[PDB]
Symmetry: C3
Subunit: 55 residues, 3 copies
């Protein structure tokens, strides 16, 4: 499920920031963004914005 992959990637973003690695978190944000592009899901869009906001 596309939405499920996006929620796992958001959790990765949060954890990567917690261990002081925003450069890896930002790499994952890019994947959520391409997920939001391929689909048209406003939930995946919401997760992308939350991810960008944490980063």
């Amino acid at each position: 499920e596309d939405r499920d992959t996006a929620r796992v990637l958001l959790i990765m973003v949060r954890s990567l920031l917690k261990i002081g690695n925003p450069e890896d978190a930002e790499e994952v944000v890019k994947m959520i963004e391409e997920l939001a592009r391929r689909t048209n899901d406003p939930e995946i869009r919401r997760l992308l914005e939350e991810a960008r906001k944490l980063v």
Copy 2:
């Protein structure tokens, strides 16, 4: 491949508990439950059970 996904998610569950985020770990258990429900693989079911036990 579905079994490798289950293994990756289990490692995430373990890692998230290690860094003190059981709420995110539980969310990853839910992702393994969705995987187990669309597959029916005895090893995926075994990985889901041992993730459940960490939580």
Copy 3:
């Protein structure tokens, strides 16, 4: 995408080494190996060698 998956796994290798679970880090390298063998994608093999160097 398989390349996105390999990037996610490399990030997991680095993060797992950072939190002190080299054994899980090595398991994820194994998954990159599986991915590298199924695909023979040259970028996935590059990411594999990057992961191996960290371990």
